Amino acid sequence: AQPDVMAELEQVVAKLDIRRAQVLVEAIIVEIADGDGLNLGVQWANTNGGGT
């Protein structure tokens, strides 16, 4: 380009070529799980009377 644009492109480039900063990203995924089943049940079977 014209020397006028060369000097303009030269500032654009210098701004655009800036050392891009780096990012360290730690994620922390914590899960906790449990639970309590209970099955208690009583059956009575009698020949004479009846069964449950």
Binding site: E26, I28, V30, I32
Partner: protein, 52 residues
């Protein structure tokens, strides 16, 4: 039910995250003090905020 909560700046977003980070940490430390009682199992705990 939906309960929104707005973070205008960063300092409100630490406190909001710190109380979930700690309430989660405090829950793990509570689970250790039952597993410690029962013996022969391990629940492993998240450190303190900002210590890695």
């Amino acid at each position: 039910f939906i309960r929104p909560t707005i973070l205008r700046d960063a300092n409100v977003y630490s406190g909001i995250s710190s109380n979930k980070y700690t309430l989660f940490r405090a829950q793990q430390l509570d689970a250790v003090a039952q597993e410690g009682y029962a013996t022969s199992p391990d629940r492993q705990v998240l450190p303190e905020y900002g210590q890695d």
